[PDB]
Amino acid sequence: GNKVTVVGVGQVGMAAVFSMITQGVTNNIAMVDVMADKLKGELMDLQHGSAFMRNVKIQASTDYSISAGSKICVVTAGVRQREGESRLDLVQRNTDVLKIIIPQLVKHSPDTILIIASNPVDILTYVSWKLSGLPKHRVIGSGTNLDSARFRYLLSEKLGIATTSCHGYIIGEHGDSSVPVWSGVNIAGVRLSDLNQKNWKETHTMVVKSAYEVIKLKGYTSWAIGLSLSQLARAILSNANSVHAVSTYLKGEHDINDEVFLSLPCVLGRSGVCDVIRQPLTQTERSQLHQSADLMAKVQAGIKF
Amino acid sequence: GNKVTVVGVGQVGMAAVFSMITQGVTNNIAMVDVMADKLKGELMDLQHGSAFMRNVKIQASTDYSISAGSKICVVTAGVRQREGESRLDLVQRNTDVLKIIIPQLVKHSPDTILIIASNPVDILTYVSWKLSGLPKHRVIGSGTNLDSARFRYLLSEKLGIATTSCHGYIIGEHGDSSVPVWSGVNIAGVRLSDLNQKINWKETHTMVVKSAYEVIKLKGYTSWAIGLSLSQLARAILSNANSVHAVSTYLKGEHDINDEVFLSLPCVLGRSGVCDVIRQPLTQTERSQLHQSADLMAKVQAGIKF
Amino acid sequence: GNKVTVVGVGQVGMAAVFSMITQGVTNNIAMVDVMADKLKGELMDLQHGSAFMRNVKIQASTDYSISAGSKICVVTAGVRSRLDLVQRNTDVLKIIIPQLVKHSPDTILIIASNPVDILTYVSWKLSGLPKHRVIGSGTNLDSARFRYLLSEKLGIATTSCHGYIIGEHGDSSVPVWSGVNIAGVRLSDLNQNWKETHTMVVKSAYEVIKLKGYTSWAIGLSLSQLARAILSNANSVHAVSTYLKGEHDINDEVFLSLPCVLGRSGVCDVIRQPLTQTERSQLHQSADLMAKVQAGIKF
Amino acid sequence: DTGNKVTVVGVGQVGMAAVFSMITQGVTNNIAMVDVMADKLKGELMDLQHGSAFMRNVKIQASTDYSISAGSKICVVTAGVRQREGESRLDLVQRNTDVLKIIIPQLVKHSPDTILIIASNPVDILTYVSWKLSGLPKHRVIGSGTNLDSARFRYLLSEKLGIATTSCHGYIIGEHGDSSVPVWSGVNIAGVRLSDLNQKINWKETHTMVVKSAYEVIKLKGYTSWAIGLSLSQLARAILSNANSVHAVSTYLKGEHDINDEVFLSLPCVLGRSGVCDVIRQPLTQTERSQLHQSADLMAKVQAGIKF
């Protein structure tokens, strides 16, 4: 009832699996990738570590039949952009990988929920949704969940107040164009303009600026997205109805008419997206969302399915 | 540096002790009361189950010396209201008990923080503060902390959304006249006036207060819920969390209140006690209710024989 | 499914429920007793505390129908000559047990009423359930405290001190010294008297009742541990009152504690310890006496 | 406050798995990472901080300057080379010793009261090398040794029997790897020795599986990371929490089991805040003693060829 499949045993996929099994998110994991020896090595390494825990089942194979009956499939596979490759060509090369992966996941787990983590995550969540044939509420992307959490942490740190009392989200397109919803940020219910306790825009820039600096320094990110994926899996498996900013089907919210995926705070539970939190955005916040959706729709129109 | 004393091994005090040691809040607990056999029996019952919890040092005695060096003293000792007993009579009977307890705690733990959990909690937090001689930020009462948790739970149940995204506080005087700060309620950053979700409101607060009294009417007392509440408050302080909790706190100087009373406000709690008070922009109706409660509290305080 | 019903909302029953909900053993609890106002009072007190926790379902009623579909039913209800005391508890259980089995035919029974061994036998017989689906709290608590105190004396963590008390709960229980080891080293071999540790574990248990009137926290924690083992399918080993006939050359159909492997189906297996003649004679002496008392019970 | 400060040396796959294990399992809230790769250190630091909302509050430092390790209670040493094709044991030991000659004096310079946990391979010899280089008391230097293999051993016994690992007891001791010693004389299930077991749900195969599967991991991905990271986190917790729990770790062996060689090999040790508080003295059989003595003999000879 709690089986999770992770596709891709690179840095992100292995950090996701390891976060999930050690944080007790699930005790039933499958890993799929194309490199048989690497897959078996990671499988055996984790099973040797399972020694420290109780009842953890791990499987791994190049054969997607190993994923059968998964409640969630987490997709981390993709390609890195080549120098001088266009944005559309990079999306298409990832799409061609997902053409192979996505229908196989659904064939073996027709009731699954998909969580897409491959970059660029918003358009590849749309692509995976289209390829899946699944309902819109059963396909999400890791989106801005990690950035929103780090945002709240940094606000909490500046204020000397626990993160559990500092509330707010980053929405929209993952990365530099994402939208800090300052109009909803509040500390114990007090909006920032109202704070009388014992500029801020840099905090958003910092969060999206640190994320790209990691890749330049160590070549990739792994731990933070791994923890974010583990949190999203827990919310779904435990039927938490907790709220997470994740890439989600956007058309029909915020006057957006383009069929795209961008991050919004979503109520997540066993059926997937139960509802989206409808934030009263300012016109400035809304216009940025619309601009991201328009540009993303234009790239999507060029994808060859 | 994590020692907690619990005064009173009645239902509330034992639920607090059990909550703290089974949830890892502290590993160093002292229980004080006047009932020597009951203290020893509770001590030995908790010790008999030692293999089923983290290692903990537990002491129990009628001698307050075992409380020496406590970071927090949780005071749950007191009487239960008698049939027809007036508020003044009940306050004075509890004050008489506190006159014995409080100076002994402060003698052995001059640097302690007091958490008062006897009813009526707001006035008895004031009494304990006045008797203790301690700084105002080092004496709090359980206040509306549990009421506020229940408030957010009932919002969560009505909306189908986890309590971790349903935000709001009940402030003021614990009980029928407490104040739901509707103006600050928000769901994932969305005020109620702007809420547009798939899955009236004022009933929720009435449900919190009516069900609270119904517990006391049916079994005679509350124990489990308040025990968990006190364990959460102790955790916030011991762990230096700077988390926000609605607790009975020194009110003069907040919201233009000039009465030296204690009522609940959301407090930032850490190792020093109350680090700060969250200053909510109250509506006129919310503010006037707080003021009326403060005025009535001052009048009852003037009748207490110290 | 993880629904647990606790029968009896006295001190032991409430301590078991509170341990289970706060230690995360289950999020689906039902409580049955005969006093409705006390029942709703406890229900509501726990529900208001669940405000601090995620999705916990609690029900409480004098009607056994609210126990329907329980994976485990924990029975703490009892009454305060020894045959007459056993008879009065049997009459109470004559009403309780058939109703529990009616509403949860696939349930496992954990009996906590005293005297636990004979009342586990009585519950099993009244239940019509397979022997592997009815256990008693038995010596599980005393064994755990025994290991803790050995560890404390040796200055080594309890997780490396191993051993069990078996047999009849209380003064006649059997410390199985032949199986006690520290990191795989038997006590006679330790290169880094003892009987007093067993005596004090059973002496302490009775001292608590004289001092505060009852025990609650320790047995509550023990019951929570047994429930977790069953619900999580741990196959962990716990000394519990269990069907004895056929083990250790016992021919009488009685219940006493042995270390049992506990999982989703109940007792998966019994750990078969090589007992000394003294250890086995004590077990047989207890079984012999239990058979004679059971022979006088009017069902 | 550095009361639980851990330094991890080396931010390769082992060191990062140890760091991540410790901070996400709450073992310590104060960690320092030291290596020679400035950018990698900063990237790992920032990656872990980026995920700060998803773990308990923690102070993380990372630097090529060992000054950041000052006041560490434990230093976990994972830096080292990977054996090259055809490389002799002597050559591999000396290449790792060259690295430790740099690392160990710097650790004890900045944390004179620290405990060392050595995790580079070959762990038993390199624990001896680190002890000699550190000048620390014998009970304050240990190696990861056979702790993980003992846990896997107990897990395999548990899987064979259908009984939780918490009731399957036993240790592998001696030299980590092919020559390690399963202490069959001390293996027991809920207090019952294997020769007495009569339960519902070839024994030697279990130890062979543990050693052969460990080698296979290294052949397939090139290294182990997740399992050893969890093992190191468990050892750190035992020491930091003063647990006095028993772990098979590489430890000073002279004077135990009639061994006269100043070597390190794994024995079950009681671990707490002072380091090794005591060694569990198992009544080993002739065969178990023979294997342990042979490993100690050979290890003394390898140690004699090390150039300090």
- In sequence order, the 6+-apart residues with CB closer than 8 A to the CB of B184 are A188, A189, A190, B167, B168, B169, B280, B281
The shortest C-alpha distance from D146 to chain A (Å) reads 13
Q: Where are the beta strands (DSSP E) in C143-235?
A: 161-162, 165-166, 174-175, 181-182, 185-186
**How many C-alpha atoms does C185 have within 13 Å on its Cβ side?**
20
> Contacts of residue C209 in chain B, CB cutoff 8 Å?
41
Under an 8 A CB cutoff, do C237 and D169 touch? Answer: no
The radius of gyration computed from the CA coordinates of chain D, to the nearest angstrom, equals: 19
- Quick check: helix, strand or coil at residue B203? helix
Q: DSSP character for D83?
A: P
Contact D176, D123 (CB under 8 A): yes
Chain centre to alpha carbon of residue D286: 27
> Contacts of residue D166 in chain C, CB cutoff 8 Å?
159, 236-237
Elucidated via: X-ray
Under an 8 A CB cutoff, do D162 and C261 touch? Answer: yes
The residues facing B61 across adjacent strands are B32
* CA dist list (Å): C55 to A22, A237, B297, C168, C208: 22, 13, 37, 39, 35
Best residue in A218, A220, A221 to probe D by mutation, most D CBs within 10 Å? Answer: A218
What CATH code is carried by the domain that includes residue A151? 3.90.110.10
The shortest C-alpha distance from C183 to chain B (Å) reads 17
Distance in angstroms (rounded) separating the CA atoms of residues C183 and D186 = 8
DSSP one-letter string for chain A: ---EEEE--SHHHHHHHHHHHHTTS-SEEEEE-S-HHHHHHHHHHHHHHHTTSSS-EEEEESSGGGGTT-SEEEE----PPPTT--HHHHHHHHHHHHHHHHHHHHHH-TT-EEEE-SSSHHHHHHHHHHHH---GGGEEE-TTHHHHHHHHHHHHHHHTS-GGGEE--EEBSSSTT-EE-GGG-EETTEEGGG-----THHHHHHHHHHHHHHHHHHSS--HHHHHHHHHHHHHHHTT--EEEEEEEE-TTSTT--S--EEEEEEEEETTEEEEE------HHHHHHHHHHHHHHHHHHTT---
- Quick check: helix, strand or coil at residue D145? coil
The radius of gyration computed from the CA coordinates of chain A, to the nearest angstrom, equals: 19
Quickly tell me which residue has 């690295």 as its tokens.
D99
What CATH code is carried by the domain that includes residue B56? 3.40.50.720
Q: DSSP character for C154?
A: H
Which of A56, A50, A16 is CA-nearest to residue A33?
A: A16
Q: DSSP character for B172?
A: B
* CA dist list (Å): A37 to B250, D52, D82, D275: 66, 33, 19, 39
Q: Which of C48, C132, C169, C238 is catalytic?
A: C169
Same domain, B194 and B223: yes
Does any CB of chain B come closer than 8 Å to the CB of residue A279? yes
**Cβ burial D195-226 (10 Å sphere, 16+ → b, else e):** eebebeeeeeebbeebbebbeebbebbebbbb
Distance in angstroms (rounded) separating the CA atoms of residues B9 and D145 = 49
The residues facing B141 across adjacent strands are B116, B248
- Quick check: helix, strand or coil at residue C182? strand
Does any CB of chain B come closer than 8 Å to the CB of residue A198? yes
Does any CB of chain C come closer than 8 Å to the CB of residue D282? yes
- Quick check: helix, strand or coil at residue D63? strand
- In sequence order, the 6+-apart residues with CB closer than 8 A to the CB of C278 are none
Distance in angstroms (rounded) separating the CA atoms of residues C67 and C101 = 10
Same domain, D37 and D139: yes
The shortest C-alpha distance from B250 to chain A (Å) reads 16
Query: What single-letter amino acid sits at B116?
Result: I
Distance in angstroms (rounded) separating the CA atoms of residues D56 and D22 = 11
Q: CA angle C55-C60-C65, nearest 5°?
A: 105
Does any CB of chain A come closer than 8 Å to the CB of residue C159? no
Which of A44, A32, B259 is CA-nearest to residue D223?
A: A44
Does any CB of chain B come closer than 8 Å to the CB of residue A189? yes
Which of C48, C47, C45, C29 is CA-nearest to residue C37?
A: C45
- Quick check: helix, strand or coil at residue B258? coil
Quickly tell me which residue has 């002072």 as its tokens.
D274
Distance in angstroms (rounded) separating the CA atoms of residues D255 and D272 = 21
Contact C287, C244 (CB under 8 A): yes
Does any CB of chain A come closer than 8 Å to the CB of residue B180? no
Q: CA angle A267-A268-A270, nearest 5°?
A: 140
Quickly tell me which residue has 């050595």 as its tokens.
D118
The residues facing B29 across adjacent strands are B4, B58
Distance in angstroms (rounded) separating the CA atoms of residues C236 and A55 = 11
Which of C195, C24, C49, C169 is CA-nearest to residue C111?
A: C169
Residue finishing a domain among D121, D145, D169? D145
Does any CB of chain B come closer than 8 Å to the CB of residue A184? yes
Distance in angstroms (rounded) separating the CA atoms of residues A236 and A231 = 9
Distance in angstroms (rounded) separating the CA atoms of residues C136 and C120 = 5
Structure tokens at C3: 């629904």
**Cβ burial A104-120 (10 Å sphere, 16+ → b, else e):** bbbebbeebbbbbbbbb
Same domain, B8 and B101: yes
Nearest residue in C to B163, CA atom: C54
> Contacts of residue C191 in chain D, CB cutoff 8 Å?
281
Distance in angstroms (rounded) separating the CA atoms of residues B175 and B159 = 25
Does any CB of chain C come closer than 8 Å to the CB of residue D58? no
Phi/psi of residue A303, nearest 5 degrees: -75, 135
Quick one: CA torsion of B272, B133, B249, B126, rounded to 10 degrees? 160
Distance in angstroms (rounded) separating the CA atoms of residues C175 and C163 = 8
Same domain, B190 and B273: yes
- Quick check: helix, strand or coil at residue C178? helix
**Secondary element (H or E) of residue B98:** helix B87-108
Distance in angstroms (rounded) separating the CA atoms of residues A32 and A36 = 9
Contact D303, D263 (CB under 8 A): yes
Q: CA angle C194-C196-C202, nearest 5°?
A: 130
Distance in angstroms (rounded) separating the CA atoms of residues D238 and D271 = 6
**Secondary element (H or E) of residue B298:** helix B284-301
The residues facing A47 across adjacent strands are none
Contact B56, B21 (CB under 8 A): yes
Contact C286, C164 (CB under 8 A): no
Which of B224, B150, B20, B230 is CA-nearest to residue C31?
A: B224
- Quick check: helix, strand or coil at residue D288? helix
Which of C143, C138, C94 is CA-nearest to residue C117?
A: C138
Q: B62: how many CB neighbours lie within 10 A of its CB? A: 12
Residue finishing a domain among A127, A143, A159? A143
Q: DSSP character for D82?
A: P
Which of D53, D37, D235, D237 is CA-nearest to residue D143?
A: D235
The shortest C-alpha distance from C166 to chain D (Å) reads 13
> Contacts of residue B280 in chain A, CB cutoff 8 Å?
188-190
Distance in angstroms (rounded) separating the CA atoms of residues D35 and D38 = 8
The radius of gyration computed from the CA coordinates of chain C, to the nearest angstrom, equals: 19
Query: What single-letter amino acid sits at D114?
Result: T
Under an 8 A CB cutoff, do D214 and A48 touch? Answer: yes
Neighbouring chains to D with at least 3 Cβ pairs closer than 8 Å: A, C
Residue finishing a domain among B104, B126, B143? B143
Largest CA distance in chain B: 59
Give the residue numbers of A marked as catalytic: 174
Give the residue numbers of B marked as catalytic: 174
Q: Is D177 left (phi over 0), alpha (psi -120 to 50) or beta?
A: left
Q: CA angle B46-B48-B53, nearest 5°?
A: 65
Structure tokens at B187: 């769901």
Distance in angstroms (rounded) separating the CA atoms of residues B182 and B202 = 9
**Secondary element (H or E) of residue C136:** strand C134-136
- Quick check: helix, strand or coil at residue C276? coil
**Secondary element (H or E) of residue B233:** helix B224-238
Distance in angstroms (rounded) separating the CA atoms of residues C136 and C110 = 5
Best residue in A137, A144, A182, A277 to probe B by mutation, most B CBs within 10 Å? Answer: A277
Q: A138: how many CB neighbours lie within 10 A of its CB? A: 18
Q: DSSP character for C180?
A: -
**Secondary element (H or E) of residue D90:** helix D89-110
Same domain, B13 and B135: yes
Under an 8 A CB cutoff, do B52 and C158 touch? Answer: no
Under an 8 A CB cutoff, do B186 and A186 touch? Answer: yes
User: Looking at the partner chain, which of A194, A274, A279 has a beta carbon nearest the beta carbon of B190?
Assistant: A279
Structure tokens at C54: 């995620």
Same domain, A127 and A154: no
Structure tokens at D304: 């004699």
Structure tokens at D263: 């070597």
Under an 8 A CB cutoff, do C44 and B214 touch? Answer: yes
Structure tokens at A9: 């045993």
Same domain, C276 and C155: yes
- In sequence order, the 6+-apart residues with CB closer than 8 A to the CB of C189 are D283
* CA dist list (Å): C220 to A253, B53, B58, C75, C216: 51, 12, 18, 12, 6
User: Looking at the partner chain, which of B52, B218, B228 has a beta carbon nearest the beta carbon of C37?
Assistant: B218
Same domain, A136 and A163: no
- Quick check: helix, strand or coil at residue B5? strand
Which of B204, B208, B202, B102 is CA-nearest to residue B158?
A: B204
**Cβ burial D270-306 (10 Å sphere, 16+ → b, else e):** bbbeebbbbbbbbbbeeebeebbbebbeebbebbeeb
Q: C107: how many CB neighbours lie within 10 A of its CB? A: 24
Same domain, B135 and B149: no
B268, exposed or middle or buried, with CB in 10 Å at 0-12, 13-18, 19+?
A: buried
Contact B241, B271 (CB under 8 A): no
Same domain, A128 and A157: no
Contact A262, A252 (CB under 8 A): no
Structure tokens at C119: 């009342």
Cis peptide bond upstream of C259, omega within 30:
no
Under an 8 A CB cutoff, do B153 and C50 touch? Answer: yes
| Overall number of domains in chain B | 2
The residues facing A266 across adjacent strands are A244, A276
Same domain, B76 and B161: no
Structure tokens at B209: 């207060």
Does any CB of chain B come closer than 8 Å to the CB of residue A167? yes
Contact D136, D116 (CB under 8 A): yes
Residue B259 belongs to domain spanning: 144-304
Best residue in C221, C222, C224 to probe B by mutation, most B CBs within 10 Å? Answer: C221
Q: DSSP character for C169?
A: S
A61, exposed or middle or buried, with CB in 10 Å at 0-12, 13-18, 19+?
A: middle
Same domain, D14 and D45: yes
Query: What single-letter amino acid sits at C141?
Result: L
Distance in angstroms (rounded) separating the CA atoms of residues C5 and B258 = 53
The residues facing D271 across adjacent strands are D245, D276
Best residue in D197, D246, D284 to probe C by mutation, most C CBs within 10 Å? Answer: D246
Structure tokens at A219: 């070549």
Structure tokens at B148: 């506020």
Distance in angstroms (rounded) separating the CA atoms of residues B151 and B168 = 7
The shortest C-alpha distance from B304 to chain C (Å) reads 31
